[PDB]
C-alpha cells in the first residue's frame, strides 16, 4: 500500500564465521549468506519502486554503513 524501508543489520566477523565453517563442512559460507542478501534486497526493491534499502555491517572493531555509501569501482556484478 505504501513504501517501506528495509534496514538489514548484518553481523559479519571472521571469528563468528570461521567457527561456523570449522564446526560444519561448508567453507566460505559467508558468500552464500552474502549472495542470498543481494537477491533478498533486490526482491525487496522489486516489491515497490519507492522503497529504500539500508545495510549496516557490525565488524569486529565497530560498525559501518554499507549502503547508502558515504559521499566521502571493481566489477563484481553483471
Amino acid at each position: 500500500e505504501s513504501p517501506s524501508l528495509l534496514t538489514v543489520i548484518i553481523e559479519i566477523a571472521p571469528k563468528l564465521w570461521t567457527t561456523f565453517d570449522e564446526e560444519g563442512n561448508e567453507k566460505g559460507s559467508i558468500i552464500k549468506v552474502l549472495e542470498a542478501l543481494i537477491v533478498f534486497l533486490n526482491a525487496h526493491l522489486a516489491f515497490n519502486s519507492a522503497n529504500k534499502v539500508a545495510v549496516i555491517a557490525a565488524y569486529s572493531q565497530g560498525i559501518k554503513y554499507l549502503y547508502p555509501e558515504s559521499t566521502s569501482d571493481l566489477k563484481i556484478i553483471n
Partner: peptide, 8 residues
C-alpha cells in the same frame, strides 16, 4: 523471467 531479473 522474474528469476533472471532478480538474480541477474
Amino acid at each position: 523471467s522474474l528469476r533472471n531479473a532478480l538474480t541477474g
